[PDB]
Amino acid sequence: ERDMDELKKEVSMDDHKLSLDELHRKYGTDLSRGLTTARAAEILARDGPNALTPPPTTPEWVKFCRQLFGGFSMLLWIGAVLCFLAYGIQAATEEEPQNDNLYLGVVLSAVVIITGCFSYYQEAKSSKIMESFKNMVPQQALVIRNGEKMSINAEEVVVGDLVEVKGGDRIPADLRIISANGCKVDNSSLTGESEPQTRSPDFTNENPLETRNIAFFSTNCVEGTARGIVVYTGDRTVMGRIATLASGLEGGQTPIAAEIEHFIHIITGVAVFLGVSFFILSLILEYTWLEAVIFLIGIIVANVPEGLLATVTVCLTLTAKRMARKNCLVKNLEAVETLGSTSTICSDKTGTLTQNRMTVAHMWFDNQIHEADTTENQSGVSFDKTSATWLALSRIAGLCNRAVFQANQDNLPILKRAVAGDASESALLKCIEVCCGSVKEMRERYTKIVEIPFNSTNKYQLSIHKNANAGEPRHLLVMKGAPERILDRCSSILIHGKEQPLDEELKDAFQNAYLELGGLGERVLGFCHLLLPDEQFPEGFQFDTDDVNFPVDNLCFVGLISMIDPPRAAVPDAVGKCRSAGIKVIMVTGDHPITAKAIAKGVGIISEGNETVEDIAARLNIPVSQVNPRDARACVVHGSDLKDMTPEQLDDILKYHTEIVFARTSPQQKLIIVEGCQRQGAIVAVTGDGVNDSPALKKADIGVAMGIAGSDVSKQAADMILLDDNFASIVTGVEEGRLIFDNLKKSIAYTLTSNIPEITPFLIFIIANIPLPLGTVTILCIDLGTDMVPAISLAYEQAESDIMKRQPRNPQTDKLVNERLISMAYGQIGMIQALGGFFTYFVIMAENGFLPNHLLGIRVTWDDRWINDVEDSYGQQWTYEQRKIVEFTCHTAFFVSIVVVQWADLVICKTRRNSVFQQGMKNKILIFGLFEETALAAFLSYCPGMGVALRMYPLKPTWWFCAFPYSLLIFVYDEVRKLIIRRRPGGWVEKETYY
């Protein structure tokens, strides 16, 4: 299969260039009569129906398992297995862990299971809402067999049978065009070409993709009619190969998951360091290998942050919820953050950056160019329509067209409403409908007699009607066509309602105007009219298209009409915000260079003032090869050159040019550009619409498709989708992703601060041989019991500064959890928390008759069930359950004290840099975190029967206030730390602490 996907990454080839003789000699077909019914029915069952094999991915609900493993749920899994193993070793004697260690493993297991359940439910919900969006309407092909046209199901079409396509019809399979009349197909999705390309029987370009003798699958035919023999069917077609390639690539590891892996390696690192060093230490004193192993497992497992999976998953889920609120839907749960880490965005032009709707831009009147309103809501400026030249031109443009408003468009806005016709004809129709009034009564005002549709050669389209005016009953003739040819066929010029001959001054003014608008990226169509000598051509004269009835030369040229597809409204602002974020924007398109660069300048991918090599060569009147490419900050790379390029050349291009636009690029080349960007070691986001973006959007670190105007294949290959087709969301994304990162740290930090006061009680327990300060149940009531709500609330923290001002993070340098962070949580704050806990501990025990210095070495006799006389400092005798009750009352106050220091830890974790007096307590979820936390702890302590159940006993009032000064110390310490960090950003406190 490797060889297969090696053959799918290579651009295609074909038989497209042949004589029709050799075409049907090879295919064994009749040109006019197609094939026989029996032959078609033979080929249909020979290989397979015409359709793509349904997407190879249909994971059974057993895919649940996918969410139960990952990289972190694995750590919790081995944690649980170590727990169960430890219990197994503890079956060596009669043992308590029935209430301790087995419960610990089962709890870990429950956490993994539930987390997987939730994440899987979210992803599955996204899957469902994606399934609902699938609307597939069967479109039956019109075939021709045994001389008769039969319209049959598209999936019944075979190889090498004659097929006819008409206006609006979708191309059934890959065809070789034998004949054509006025046929413009829409290739916008497949090859990326914006304007409809004419299709002809003739061989034009060597590359089968840009040639005119081939029609492609999934392309809609704009206008005209055509006949062709089917070259390819089903999965063997072009987009079928694109789809099978896109389905056969790999997602790649997300930066977030990688950071999680690094983090895990750290935590397990200190886990086994402590475990081993303490195993050795414990063997150094007394305890046998049994007890020693028990201690090893106890520590390594204790170092595992049980609730951190839950909290992180919930966090990602929350941000994902907001993304969904903005109608930005991410297929994958961990692909939400990726945007924030993206240093380069490769975007396609048509369908993505643009509205993909051809619209009239500038016009030519009286040797003057006037810009129309190109906005969708018509919020711009209208030209001056008082001029009669505009009246004449508008009448010409409106009267000769194939464009017709379809039946059901009435209430809809004249722009966004549907039109049956060509691109140019649609734009013209809409413009004339808005500006000059209704084109209905105006088109039927003049009665069309005999018209010539745009020819295969010279492409001139003319029509001629009677006169609707009062004074002059002359026969009116109108023609539109390419500026140069109509320049060849015209003599007279119209200005301000009165004619003239052509003088080379204003003729070349017209020329330079045409080259200006053409160089501006817009496509220009020349418009002319000639009234006729009704004396020579009477009112009864019936003239046909056989010969020339009308003086094809010496016409009256009126003006030019240029058109282009505008960018979507939120696009320029979005690109600006992206460039402000430090993200490099590179347009990647298979469109023509002239339009590509223009659009790029329009949206701001290429800024004002920057010049390409060709621009410098143009201004200085020197050969293009002369100027130094280093002097060119912006570049447009023709697709022709990219095929001959090596990796070093692409690297140099990407390095030495800030504003880059790749034009006339095939899908595979898009893939190569993306991979080239990844060779630089930089995170990549790609945005596209059609199937040509399917290989790119798949391979990219994160893909982004368009909900409506995007195709199905690239929608499947994308890791993210925009439902409302709002480009601005991308900015929000890189905003969101950049924020959620910071909060995550905080979140993580918080829980990891809890482990030090969690672990140490069982540590010194082994060391100083003191009664156990902190039980297992309490610890579970901390990690999963209390800290949950604050840790989640830490996700509702906002930006501490402008996040879109800073440069994108460095994956190698900037880490999620790094040495600084551990230096903080484990090193400093957690230690103070532990001190607070042991303080409370000693307070309780000392107040009940057991002094701290006496408490050393007691546990041996203390944990003994059968010693019921145990002397405190006062000389009193304690039974087992009595002193164990005291110890259990020490557990609860230790737990509460943990909550108490977690107050201060929560507040200070709320902000990594800013002082709390700045960022404010404005987060409400945080406040409720505190209240709920305290109330929960107090409940656990004081709820009836909890001394029987969890063996948590009520606390005397004073107990509660023992942990206060340590918490205050934590707050003050981190506050002055977050002071000095602000004041001295050299900085020692900044390098060592700030995380």
Binding site: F842, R865, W866, Y874, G875, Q876, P965
Partner: protein
């Protein structure tokens, strides 16, 4: 690991970091010791702050077992050496030669008598005297030289002892007492104890019970109470009560529960040694 110039991982500034942690952890330590010091300033030298936890005092045995079971061969010396040595080290403090001093010791009634109240909890009066306890008070079990001496060797014997609680003044059951089983009539001045095979249910019971108390009285004299603490009354000798089982079934294991009765006494079903007692033999 190492390159120029760093020690794994980054070793240039190590002095700064480690100094910072020395000072830091030093401050943390000092702070903790401070809080603990004030905490220790708030604790009394005479009476503990909370006595509510030990409130139902427990009953304990002289040969504390692995788990509540005396199982030994009446023949093999090495069988009961454990128990025997335990009782030896237990009653080593009670010898007539062990208490010589009339200074720190007081010769009290040969018969159970009223509670002895000495001053207050404070140090106003000096170190308090302690009543004497003669080993003769327990006959046939460890009385001086003559007999046993095998310490239950012919037939099982165990002394029961009440736990010590500061200021505790044991209240014996009223003379109106409800079904306390055969007991003597001296009830006002002593805290009583009685033993049975199984408590409230059908019994395997085989036994013959002989009690040695103060003056041959099955219970603790109140004249040894209240206990004034380790500080005010060091070398304090608490009352002891010997219980011998003469007739028993030898090769079969039976269980025995001893209960102490009184108003100041209470029992926990969860704590089997609290207020009551359990031994398998």
């Amino acid at each position: 690991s190492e390159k120029k110039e760093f020690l794994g991982r980054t070793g240039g500034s190590w002095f700064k970091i480690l100094l910072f942690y020395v000072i830091f952890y030093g401050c943390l330590a000092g702070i903790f010791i401070g809080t603990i010091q004030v905490m220790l300033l708030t604790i009394s030298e005479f009476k503990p702050t909370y006595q509510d936890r030990v409130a139902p005092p427990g009953l304990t045995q002289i040969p504390q077992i692995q788990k509540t079971e005396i199982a030994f061969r009446p023949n093999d010396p090495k069988s009961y050496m454990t128990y025997v040595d335990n009782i030896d080290n237990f009653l080593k403090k009670y010898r007539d030669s062990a208490q010589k001093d009339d200074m720190i010791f007081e010769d009290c009634g040969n018969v159970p008598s009223e509670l002895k109240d000495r001053g207050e909890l404070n140090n106003e009066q000096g170190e308090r005297k302690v009543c004497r306890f003669k080993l003769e008070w327990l006959g046939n079990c460890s009385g001086i030289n003559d007999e046993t001496y095998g310490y239950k060797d012919g037939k099982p014997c165990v002394i029961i002892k009440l736990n010590r609680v500061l200021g505790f003044k044991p209240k014996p059951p009223k003379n109106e007492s409800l079904e306390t089983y055969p007991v003597m009539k001296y009830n006002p001045y002593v805290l009583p104890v009685q033993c049975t095979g199984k408590r409230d249910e059908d019994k395997e019971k085989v036994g013959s019970i002989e009690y040695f108390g103060l003056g041959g009285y099955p219970g603790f004299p109140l004249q040894y109470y209240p206990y004034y603490g380790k500080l005010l009354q060091p070398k304090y000798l608490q009352p002891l009560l010997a219980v011998q089982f003469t007739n028993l079934t030898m090769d079969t294991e039976i269980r025995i529960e001893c209960k102490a009765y009184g108003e100041n006494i209470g029992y926990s079903e969860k704590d089997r040694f609290q207020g009551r007692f359990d031994v398998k033999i």
